[PDB]
Design a protein around this nucleic acid. Structure first.
Ligand SMILES: [Mg+2]
Ligand SMILES: [Mg+2]
Ligand SMILES: [Mg+2]
Ligand SMILES: [Mg+2]
Ligand SMILES: [Mg+2]
Ligand SMILES: [Mg+2]
Ligand SMILES: [Mg+2]
Ligand SMILES: [Mg+2]
Lengths: 120, 374, 46, 205
RNA sequence: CCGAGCCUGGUGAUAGCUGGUUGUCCAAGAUAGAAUCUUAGUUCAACUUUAAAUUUGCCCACAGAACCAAAUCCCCUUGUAAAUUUAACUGUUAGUCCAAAGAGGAACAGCUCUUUGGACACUAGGAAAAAACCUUGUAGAGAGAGUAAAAAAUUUAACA
């Protein structure tokens, strides 16, 4: 009987060796997370299909993001096996309305304050 | 097994007396007995004569053991009641209850219409009050209308042939009988048609259901061989006579040739019985039109298996637990497939062990029953 | 190019709104905790 | 009595009601009768199945054919044939349920010890007879002494503790990592990727 | 053309039987049960879909759900968008295959028969060929680019 099946809480239990292996720290978590699809909407639970629909993941291999709330955490972990998340960082400040236009996303995590036209 | 039910020493000794026919409880009996001993109001559909009456009675005996004798004061009604649709079924139930209550303290009584009401309403029958009483609905309704019995004193009710008790002739008298509503209600049957079960829902509150065997149309017993009559009705009785000639072989070997014939109409049963008695067959006929004393004598003879050929009307299709039932002929195929299956389960009522022969005649109205035969 | 600009403005507006939501949620959680502590302190009098 | 007792085809008390043949009674590594019981050598079942009176009688014939009762005693640890496997009428209409019972057989899962051998004899001399029996056995098995089973258990523990894989069967499976739950068995959390149906893969470290 | 002459009318006879039934473009839309002299058909049954009228649904968290395993149902928030009565017609119901769960038969079979989940009778690339396995989903053109699934591995008997 295939179902939305139970998985342990240890799947979301990190390790200090893991936090070193990953780029994460136990303190000061991420403010917003990003997500993407790299697996088929086909051949999973239809419940999970509408879950990915709820995720705004009707595109695929395209970026999207949300606020990584615990409810959002559970929603993502429901469809985690098909999806990927990213620590959608922003080393600079958040985009002010004065700087409303010049923003972008560099895949390592950067949100651009001003993506100008000349190099460094 | 039976010891899992915590039977009393009288109950354990009676169960040991039921050996080798009872060495352990049946699986349906295992499912039924302690849940009833849990006091839950429920209905159980299972094999006829599968010890289901004993499974209901053992938990009833345990519940009556927890009941005080002070409710057994004079003039009141019983606390343990059972219902049967036929006087013969009620008499058989009362006879079975009197064996178990010989080593117990429960008083067992029977009530049915067409019998002596002086003995029914006797001072040691109605007024002294009993623990176990199996009663027909008509006699009980007459007693309640005449204040010869009560309904506030009941504590454990059993509905045998509850589907037959759910008959349109039988539902109104049962509802009139329906009375303390907190009593523990248990119903027993062979199968539950849906249109009657919701009728139970008219007087139900979170009950339980215990079903046995296949959940589909459990038409064919694995221990019963069945045949289809590929011939017209005109010589079919003659073919039945030929089957009687075949039953002549069954009369030859001593392997018991107790034959039960299904007849739809009492007058048709009388005509067929006059033909068979004319045909030098040792046949006895029981019907709803038979005299009550004559029916009682015929039922006692069939209990003794005195008449190897016995015809039965619509009054005697289901519920039968007859020893040595080896020959069953639906001389008239039953108008209900449930009725045909119930007549089939009436024979070989010792369980999955005692074998028997089944032959059913086929008529034109039963042509649509051929699809039911599929 | 205008399409990419609009999509960028969309992602920026979403991130900003989520940031404001998270900040207000933390502030509300702290305010609720402070109110609960004040009520617990004021429920031990008279 | 330093000899193998005869196994009957069916018990004196029969089985009145029909019953099914569940593969789960042979599926999985068995826990009962897994170690030596008053024995220094036996045959550990390297697979699941059911042994009838025929396989038991062949084993008893092969044991009593080559045994020294003053030095080697053998006791069959498995029970007699008890599970009723039936067969229907030949040339009967297809479907329609089950007929009378055909023959009895007792089912044994993987890891069960079959015949305990003891006395003034080692497993090395009886190794040839045990290998012939195992090749002729109903299920796959392995002739193991009292110390051979311990050596195998220690080798398996060493193989398990010396694993170098960056991904393990439980490490993706119990995690339900990449949607293998679309194919993962409900009982697959129990064999840990070692028991696949009727075959038993102890060689997987 | 004799197993009941031939022809004309009656005769567009009749069977629920097969098959075929004509140009385009947008909106929605694929498998549950019960009766039936019935399974080659039809009727109660559900879904829809549309037209109108009336404001919360799907995903869930606590508690709770029985005596003779996976679980499942009622079920605050979260994210996301539709839901309840009244009506009309049609249309499926004889589905296939695969992973799990049972019953039968050899524990033969592109065998049967009920529950759960998919896809499937509907695109493209790959497994050599490809109704079913993996990826992938949905509209056009460009002579750019990134990417996904992606070709099987492999061998031995030394001994004091
Ligand atoms: Mg209804
Ligand atoms: Mg049905
Ligand atoms: Mg014409
Ligand atoms: Mg026509
Ligand atoms: Mg037709
Ligand atoms: Mg009909
Ligand atoms: Mg008819
Ligand atoms: Mg028809």
């Amino acid at each position: 009987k295939f179902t939305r099946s139970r998985i342990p809480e240890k799947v979301f239990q990190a390790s200090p060796e893991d936090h070193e292996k990953y780029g994460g720290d136990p303190q000061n978590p991420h403010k917003l997370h990003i997500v993407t699809r790299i697996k088929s909407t086909r051949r999973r639970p239809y419940w999970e299909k509408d879950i990915i629909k709820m995720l705004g993941l009707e595109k695929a291999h395209t970026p999207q993001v949300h606020k990584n709330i615990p409810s959002v955490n559970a929603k993502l972990k429901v469809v985690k096996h098909l999806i990927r998340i990213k620590p959608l960082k922003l080393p600079q400040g958040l985009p002010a309305e004065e700087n409303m236009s010049n923003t972008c996303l560099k895949s390592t995590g950067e949100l651009v304050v001003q993506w100008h036209l000349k190099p460094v | 097994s039976f010891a899992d039910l915590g039977l009393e020493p009288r109950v354990l000794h009676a169960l040991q007396e039921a050996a080798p026919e009872v060495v352990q409880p049946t699986t349906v009996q295992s499912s039924t007995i302690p849940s009833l001993l849990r006091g839950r109001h429920v209905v159980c559909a299972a094999e006829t004569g599968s010890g289901k009456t004993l499974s209901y009675l053992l938990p009833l005996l345990q519940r009556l053991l927890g009941q005080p004798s002070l409710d057994s004061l004079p003039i009141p009604a019983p606390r343990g009641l059972v219902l049967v649709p036929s006087r013969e079924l009620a008499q058989q139930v009362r006879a079975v209850a009197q064996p178990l209550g010989r080593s117990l303290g429960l008083l067992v009584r029977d009530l049915e219409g067409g019998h002596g009401m002086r003995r029914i309403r006797l001072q040691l029958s109605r007024q002294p009050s009993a623990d176990v009483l199996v009663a027909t609905p008509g006699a009980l309704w007459k007693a309640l209308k005449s204040r010869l019995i009560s309904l506030e004193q009941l504590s454990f009710l059993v509905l045998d042939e509850a589907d037959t008790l759910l008959d349109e002739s039988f539902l109104e008298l049962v509802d009139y009988i329906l009375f303390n509503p907190k009593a523990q209600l248990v119903l027993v049957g062979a199968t539950f048609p849906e249109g009657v079960g919701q009728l139970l829902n008219k007087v139900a509150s979170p009950d339980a259901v215990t079903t046995i065997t296949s959940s589909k149309l459990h038409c064919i017993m694995p221990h019963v061989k069945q045949t289809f009559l590929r011939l017209k009705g005109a010589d079919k009785v003659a073919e039945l006579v030929h089957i009687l000639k075949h039953r002549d072989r069954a009369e030859r070997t001593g392997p018991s040739g107790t034959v039960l014939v299904f007849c739809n109409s009492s007058s048709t049963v009388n005509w067929l019985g006059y033909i068979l008695d004319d045909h030098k067959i040792q046949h006895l006929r029981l019907q709803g039109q038979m005299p009550a004393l004559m029916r009682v004598g015929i039922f006692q003879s069939f209990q003794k298996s005195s008449r190897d050929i016995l015809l039965c009307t619509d009054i005697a299709s289901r519920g039968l637990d007859s020893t040595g039932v080896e020959l069953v002929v639906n001389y008239d195929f039953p108008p209900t497939l449930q009725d045909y299956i119930h007549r089939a389960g009436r024979v070989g009522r010792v369980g999955s062990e005692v074998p028997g022969t089944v032959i059913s005649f086929v008529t034109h109205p039963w042509d649509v029953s051929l699809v039911q035969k599929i | 190019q205008l399409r990419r600009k609009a999509e960028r403005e969309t992602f920026a507006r979403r991130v900003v709104l989520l940031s404001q939501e998270m900040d207000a949620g933390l502030q509300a959680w702290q305010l609720r905790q402070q109110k609960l502590q004040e009520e617990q302190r004021k429920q031990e009098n008279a | 009595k330093p000899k193998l007792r005869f196994i009957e085809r069916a018990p004196l008390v029969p089985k009145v009601r029909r019953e099914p043949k569940n593969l789960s009674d042979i599926r999985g590594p068995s826990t009962e009768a897994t170690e030596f019981t008053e024995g220094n050598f036996a045959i550990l079942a390297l697979g699941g199945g059911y042994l009838h009176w025929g396989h038991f009688e062949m084993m008893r014939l092969t044991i009593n054919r080559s045994m020294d009762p003053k030095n080697m005693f053998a006791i069959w640890r498995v029970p007699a044939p008890f599970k009723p496997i039936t067969r229907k009428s030949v040339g009967h209409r297809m479907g329609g349920g089950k007929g009378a019972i055909d023959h009895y057989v007792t089912p044994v899962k993987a890891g069960r010890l079959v015949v305990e051998m003891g006395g003034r004899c080692e497993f090395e001399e009886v190794q040839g007879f045990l290998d012939q029996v195992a090749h002729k056995l109903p299920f796959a098995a392995k002739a193991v002494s009292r110390g051979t089973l311990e050596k195998m258990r220690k080798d398996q523990e060493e193989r398990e503790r010396n694993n170098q894989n960056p991904w393990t069967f439980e490490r993706i499976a119990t995690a339900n990592m990449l949607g293998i739950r679309k194919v993962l068995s409900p009982y697959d959390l129990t064999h840990k990727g070692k028991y696949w149906g009727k075959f038993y893969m102890p060689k997987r470290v």
